[PDB]
Amino acid sequence: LRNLPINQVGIKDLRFPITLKTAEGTQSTVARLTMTVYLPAEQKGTHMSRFVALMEQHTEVLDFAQLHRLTAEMVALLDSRAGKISVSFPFFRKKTAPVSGIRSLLDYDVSLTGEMKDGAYGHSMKVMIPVTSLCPCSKEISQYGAHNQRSHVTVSLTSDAEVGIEEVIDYVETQASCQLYGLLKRPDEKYVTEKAYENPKFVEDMVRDVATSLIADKRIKSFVVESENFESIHNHSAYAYIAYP
Amino acid sequence: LRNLPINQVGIKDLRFPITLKTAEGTQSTVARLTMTVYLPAEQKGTHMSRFVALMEQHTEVLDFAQLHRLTAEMVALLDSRAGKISVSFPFFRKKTAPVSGIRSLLDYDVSLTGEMKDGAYGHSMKVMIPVTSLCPCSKEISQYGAHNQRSHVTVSLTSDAEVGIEEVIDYVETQASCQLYGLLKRPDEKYVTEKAYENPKFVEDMVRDVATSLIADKRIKSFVVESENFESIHNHSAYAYIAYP
Amino acid sequence: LRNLPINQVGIKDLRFPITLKTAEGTQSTVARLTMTVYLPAEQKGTHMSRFVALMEQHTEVLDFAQLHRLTAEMVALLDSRAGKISVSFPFFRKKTAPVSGIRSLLDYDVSLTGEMKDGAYGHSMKVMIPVTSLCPCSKEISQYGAHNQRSHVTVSLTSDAEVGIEEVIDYVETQASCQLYGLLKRPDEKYVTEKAYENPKFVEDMVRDVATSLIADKRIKSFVVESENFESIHNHSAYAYIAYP
Amino acid sequence: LRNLPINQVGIKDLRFPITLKTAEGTQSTVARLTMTVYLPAEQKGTHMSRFVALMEQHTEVLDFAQLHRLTAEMVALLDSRAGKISVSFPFFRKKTAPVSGIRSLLDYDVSLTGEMKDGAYGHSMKVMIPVTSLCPCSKEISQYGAHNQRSHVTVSLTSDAEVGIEEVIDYVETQASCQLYGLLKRPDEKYVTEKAYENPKFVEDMVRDVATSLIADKRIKSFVVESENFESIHNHSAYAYIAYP
Numbered sequence A, B, C, D: 001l002r003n004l005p006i007n008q009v010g011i012k013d014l015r016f017p018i019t020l021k022t023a024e025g026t027q028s029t030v031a032r033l034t035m036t037v038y039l040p041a042e043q044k045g046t047h048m049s050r051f052v053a054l055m056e057q058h059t060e061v062l063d064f065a066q067l068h069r070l071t072a073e074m075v076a077l078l079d080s081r082a083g084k085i086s087v088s089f090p091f092f093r094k095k096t097a098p099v100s101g102i103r104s105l106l107d108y109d110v111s112l113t114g115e116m117k118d119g120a121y122g123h124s125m126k127v128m129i130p131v132t133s134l135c136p137c138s139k140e141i142s143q144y145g146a147h148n149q150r151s152h153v154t155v156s157l158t159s160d161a162e163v164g165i166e167e168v169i170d171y172v173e174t175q176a177s178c179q180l181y182g183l184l185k186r187p188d189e190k191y192v193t194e195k196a197y198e199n200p201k202f203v204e205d206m207v208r209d210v211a212t213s214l215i216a217d218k219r220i221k222s223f224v225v226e227s228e229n230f231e232s233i234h235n236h237s238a239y240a241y242i243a244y245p
């Protein structure tokens, strides 16, 4: 009576090396794990060591399948009817060379969750994409030139089916006025202006475009899209988000 | 070209100094503000300048009523049906050492949110109370000693009636194995050490014990209680939360 | 023999409200304090409560004089021949209106140190200034428009004599292609492009210009100047610094 | 127009995945890189693209020698007399629980720096070891219990000879009231709790005890030892450092 069920309990912010397999190759990274389960009213404690125990044992590559695998095994190991694992980490993508084979690397911040309710599995995903946004109402008053600044686009979402980290990166960068590339001389600098100068976007635009994509994709049962446009003109961001449904 | 509502759009993390009135006095602090409005589909973009305007003008001491006032004035100006203000800040309170009674400030992190949805007002608040936790497992099994650590309890709740920040602080501080003070003399430090060793609590115990107090407060419609213990024997945290309902 | 003198010891990251007096008015803020003293080889411990004790007692406005005052009083209170106090906090500046009396606020991150060696006082200062830098080699390849991004300029320095937080802000913004103002319509936006478009600067330029000022000022016995130009084109900064002498 | 040398100029916080070789094995981690060169007075600007180039090309396991190799290759390419590379990263090591012997990784933060000054090479390294501290004052004065907390010991040193990261870890872990492990079973947790209560240490004691070990290592020319204890009875830290010489 006095004691209540605890929605979730376990470890949080355990920093752990993970080798990650996505559909454009395997890569090694450093993740930060949160791992928890439902604890019923009559049980005083969960078992804290078993969460770390699980991760130490499982040196298998982490993909969508392996994340289900761990999460079901977790509820198993700790004798609970529910629980979640989250894995946050930087994710790197190789961008092949638009000039002579000089291809740069770009870093993204990604976070995968896996959840077991009673036997039912559910997964969700969060990905932050840094982009170079350009303003179209700052080119409208100025005869020449415009207000350019770095902007971040986060995309949180839930699906029944597997959805690649990169598919989401791409969903976002497609709409990007111009995305972040690696330093290449004169050649790669000419067409970074013109792509963002004649089609520039606001914080409101960026969320709409990305949302439109996300509505289309029947796998995505729900999402949130945030864009943050760090005004160079003030020490504070322009911000907007959309949730669906 | 466009056909998508934006749930919220505005400025985020405007860092702004403020003067705050609470039951126990008035203080000067520094705040992060996020302020945003609903944006209808065919409307292309909100009016970013107007947020900042609103805040430069109002020099009024912040208080439950003032937040309401400010959030209704915000949807008015930017001409919108719904909107949100959130103000985050360190909050100070004067404490009394338990034996010697020497006075010292302790610091807390607060976030207060006002929301308007078609004339209706809601306010929620988040508060973070650092306290001490001491492990009952370590106490029991050991011929002496008990590992203890600083821990963050974070309460978020919603209410129609105003709940004082200090009120949420007392609910937590009371239940903590023991609480923190800036100033302690030998007898004080003797007191607190022994207090913790007498009243050990799992992360489960804290959130449970705090949740109950909250449930016993008719004003509170909903809450989350989190407790993170930065285990002094691990390099990760123990973590638990209860959500009501 | 086995035990050594400890250069410094005390409290670190004590978060405390301070009312700060500079030569353009008094303002209230929230500071983070580090406070320490030399501990000789024969002494096992310092006195940790006295650092907090001092701050609780002294509710006098903090200016250059008051910071000496505290620092000498500190070594006194804790019976040591040396020690330092540092105070970090955000500092706000009122920027009067270039159009009809609509004047915005901008936040800066400042940090003041005070040190007593044997009786000799020494002070130093650190100030981070956010600026809107524009590139002049990105306007050189493009016929119209250029690569604009937010950049941060930190200025650390030591003086015999008082040097105002604002004098340093100004030293930096003078050289600024354009500095951060508050949102004003059409009027204030026209001359934010032209000031940074015809005189744009790199990371190397910004450090040189600011250094030149700092060499001039006979009060400044030494400094460091850092500029960080967060490339919107990559998730990593362009960086440079100069130390003198 | 210009007449001022720049001590260092380059890119900062390039976030890059790496493979690292140490005495006890080879691991995959993620790194922040800062790379910079000396810039002579009348030379206007360094060549930012070339830093990134250098790193995309070299896929070699990182190791003491490789850092040297990389920093000499860097001044070569950018055509400069002096320069600095610094690589920061989480570092993992496999530990053995003290009683049960169960294996678990603990995580550390390392920063390795190479510097070239006119053909001469220097390397320094910084390392942060989380450990447990337990107060001897609290132990003494109290009829039972001792407040303890997690604490960060941070060692920075310079040497002509290579010092293994794990070597610096062992110097600290040994002196800690007790050390951390990811996995502990009851007997293990019993062990560590009791170990700390037996070997209590002021922040003064730790840095002192660790400093001595360092002094006893002819390879180390200079060092700083810091220890921050996140006091479980306060909301600020105790802090001390020794600098040699």
Ligand SMILES: Nc1nc2c([nH]c(=O)n2[C@@H]2O[C@H](COP(=O)(O)OP(=O)(O)OP(=O)(O)O)[C@@H](O)[C@H]2O)c(=O)[nH]1
Pocket (backbone or CB within 6 Å): A045, A046, A047, A048, A049, A050, B135, B137, B138, B201, B202, B203, B204, B229, B238, D184, D185, D186, D189
């Ligand atoms: N549930 C819980 N356990 C904790 C906390 N802090 C803490 O040190 N522990 C340690 O973790 C233990 C929980 O059980 P455990 O994971 O070691 O597993 P167990 O001994 O119950 O059985 P096992 O050997 O089958 O895993 C407690 O007995 C205690 O020693 C906490 O806040 N909550």
Ligand SMILES: Nc1nc2c([nH]c(=O)n2[C@@H]2O[C@H](COP(=O)(O)OP(=O)(O)OP(=O)(O)O)[C@@H](O)[C@H]2O)c(=O)[nH]1
Pocket (backbone or CB within 6 Å): B184, B185, B186, B189, C045, C046, C047, C048, C049, C050, D135, D137, D138, D201, D202, D203, D204, D229, D238
């Ligand atoms: N020096 C030191 N003191 C500590 C640490 N941790 C800690 O709790 N303390 C507490 O702080 C005390 C240091 O003295 P204090 O500031 O209370 O002053 P005091 O009792 O020596 O004399 P006072 O009453 O004249 O100030 C210790 O006795 C201890 O209870 C630490 O790491 N170093």
Ligand SMILES: [Zn+2]
Pocket (backbone or CB within 6 Å): B135, B136, B137, B138, B147, D189
């Ligand atoms: Zn325990």
Ligand SMILES: [Zn+2]
Pocket (backbone or CB within 6 Å): B189, D135, D136, D137, D138, D147
């Ligand atoms: Zn103590």
